[PDB]
Design a protein around this ligand. Structure first.
Ligand SMILES: Nc1nc2c(ncn2[C@@H]2O[C@H](COP(=O)(O)OP(=O)(O)O)[C@@H](O)[C@H]2O)c(=O)[nH]1
Ligand SMILES: OC1CCN(C(=S)c2c[nH]c3ccccc23)CC1
Ligand SMILES: [Mg+2]
Length: 170
């Protein structure tokens, strides 16, 4: 089989995890999607000349059992850490997602991309510079997206695969 990348989208409720995932997989923006549904999706894509399979988990936070959270975190190879630019709390939560994923995987070297979503909205509480400072501290890429206009979406997910490939080659 062609190579498959297991990607996990994490972040506070309401930040756009579902909207981003459906934009990438189905190329449309969804106004409402039950905030409690946690599904995964497959899409074949070409990234820098490589035909590959993306397997993306759109997380919904708590699980029936905490062992399930641990299971997706060990299985997933890269993590999109999403906040919304209009939700300071979602940005603060990023510290906790960072910590947890590293701690389940028992690794200092986990492919992640920091994503500030809803960039189309006028309302902003999190400035670009503050998110840049965070990403610099983590040594990972940062991208601002709009699930609504699709701006930065393929960049966010393809950048994550690129981080995974850097990780593999060590
Ligand atoms: N304007 C705008 N709204 C968005 C964007 N992403 C998500 N939303 C909306 O924000 C709400 C939460 O999105 P959702 O994908 O359910 O968030 P999730 O809880 O992280 O899965 C929904 O009403 C979406 O339509 C975006 O980039 N721009
Ligand atoms: O029930 C939880 C979510 C689905 N689970 C996994 S491991 C995944 C299901 N699809 C995925 C795509 C990327 C990374 C992980 C997954 C098991 C734990
Ligand atoms: Mg959702």
């Amino acid at each position: 089989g062609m190579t498959e990348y297991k990607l996990v989208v994490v972040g506070a409720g309401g930040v756009g995890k579902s909207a981003l995932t459906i934009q990438l997989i189905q190329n449309h923006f969804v106004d409402e999607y039950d905030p409690t549904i946690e599904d995964s999706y497959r899409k074949q894509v070409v990234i820098d000349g490589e035909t590959c399979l993306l397997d993306i988990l759109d997380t919904a936070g708590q699980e029936e059992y905490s062992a399930m959270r641990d299971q997706y975190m060990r299985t997933g190879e890269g993590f999109l850490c999403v906040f919304a630019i209009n939700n300071t709390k979602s940005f603060e939560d990023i510290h906790h997602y960072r910590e947890q994923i590293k701690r389940v995987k028992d690794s200092e070297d986990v492919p992640m991309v920091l994503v500030g979503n809803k960039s189309d909205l006028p309302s902003r509480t999190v400035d670009t510079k503050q998110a840049q400072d965070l990403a610099r501290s983590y040594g990972i890429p940062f991208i601002e997206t709009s699930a609504k206009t699709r701006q930065g979406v393929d960049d966010a997910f393809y950048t994550l695969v690129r981080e995974i490939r850097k990780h593999k080659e060590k």
